[PDB]
């Protein structure tokens, strides 16, 4: 049966709200960490 800061590179999302979708993920650049939030219309 299917499998059961590792969150790195994984996709995260806020619940859609009033037409807009918010995607987010933490990526690493050298020794720094950037959590990016993208606001995009459905």
């Amino acid at each position: 049966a299917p499998p059961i800061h590792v969150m790195l590179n994984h996709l995260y999302a806020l619940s859609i709200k009033d037409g807009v979708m918010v995607l987010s993920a933490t990526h690493r650049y050298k020794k720094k960490y950037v959590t990016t939030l993208l606001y995009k219309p459905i």
């Binding site: 037409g19 650049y29 720094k32 959590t35 990016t36 219309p41």
Partner: protein, 285 residues
């Protein structure tokens, strides 16, 4: 190089050096309704956001309060960022101004000034990722940490008058009785961040920013109202020509404000010294 240590210091450090160990970056897709974008800006507590165009598959610039000023000066909320940038052909006329993580801080200040902008996206040439958004504010803080812990150049003791840093002519201002929509007009015309508010004798009694204008617009309740009446909806740092550049830097940085209003003994506005003025003085020269 004591009298040019700061320029050398800025040349010797990369933009990557002042990026936090962990930071948050809010990005807007250009097809976002201008209304939603603003609320997104508010709820995340930021002033500006990089713009990603899905059609072009590229970052095409910044969404700043000035853009809202332009739009408002001219349904407005219902339209998409794209649409409004199109009206001004923003992409073509004023293309994205960015910088690499490995570029020097000196290049960051140079670029900010030369291009008369306030937001400078740090973009990795390798991945094309926007890493961080540079501001005079942030750069000055960084510089400060070095300033108050390294033997200061004699010119850091010289006064404001002696160094002639700041703008002391053509000063755009408002009067307490000035209608907000008039202030709006002088913002677009003079391309200036904030307006000193002067009383009947021309004494400064307040400051008025683009942010104030837009916040009032958000409330949606005409603009005819004077500036002081509008300023009551809210929720003045000044300097003298005989104060040391060091003392001005200190006041500007810990107040975490964007500029000081240079003023008379009677608090009559003589001029203005902004962060960009300081940077240009410390670094670019």
């Amino acid at each position: 190089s004591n009298s040019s240590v700061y320029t050398t210091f800025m040349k010797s450090h990369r933009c990557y050096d002042l990026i936090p160990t962990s930071s948050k970056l809010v990005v807007f897709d250009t097809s976002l309704q201008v209304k939603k974008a603003f609320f997104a800006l508010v709820t995340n507590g930021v002033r500006a956001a990089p713009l990603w165009d899905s059609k072009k598959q590229s970052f095409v610039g910044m969404l700043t309060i000035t853009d809202f000023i332009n739009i408002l000066h001219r349904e407005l909320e219902e339209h998409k960022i794209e649409t409004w940038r199109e009206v001004y052909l923003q992409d073509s006329f004023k293309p994205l101004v960015c910088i690499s993580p490995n570029a020097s801080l000196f290049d960051a200040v140079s670029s900010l000034i030369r291009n008369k902008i306030h937001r400078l996206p740090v973009i990795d040439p390798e991945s094309g990722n926007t890493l961080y958004i540079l501001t005079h504010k942030r750069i000055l803080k960084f510089l400060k940490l070095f300033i108050t812990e390294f033997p200061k150049p004699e010119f850091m003791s010289k006064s404001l008058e002696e160094l002639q840093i700041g703008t002391y002519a053509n000063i755009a201002m408002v009067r307490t009785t000035t209608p907000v929509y008039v202030a709006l007009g002088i913002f677009v015309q003079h391309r200036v961040s904030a307006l000193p508010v002067v009383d009947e004798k021309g004494r400064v009694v307040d400051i008025y920013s683009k942010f104030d204008v837009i916040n009032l617009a958000a409330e949606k309740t005409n603009l005819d109202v004077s500036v002081t009446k509008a300023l009551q909806h809210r929720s003045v740092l000044k300097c003298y020509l005989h104060e040391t550049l060091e003392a001005i830097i200190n006041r500007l940085v810990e107040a975490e404000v964007h500029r000081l209003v240079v003023v008379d003994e009677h608090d009559v506005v003589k001029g203005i010294v902004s962060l960009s003025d300081i940077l240009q003085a410390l670094v670019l020269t």
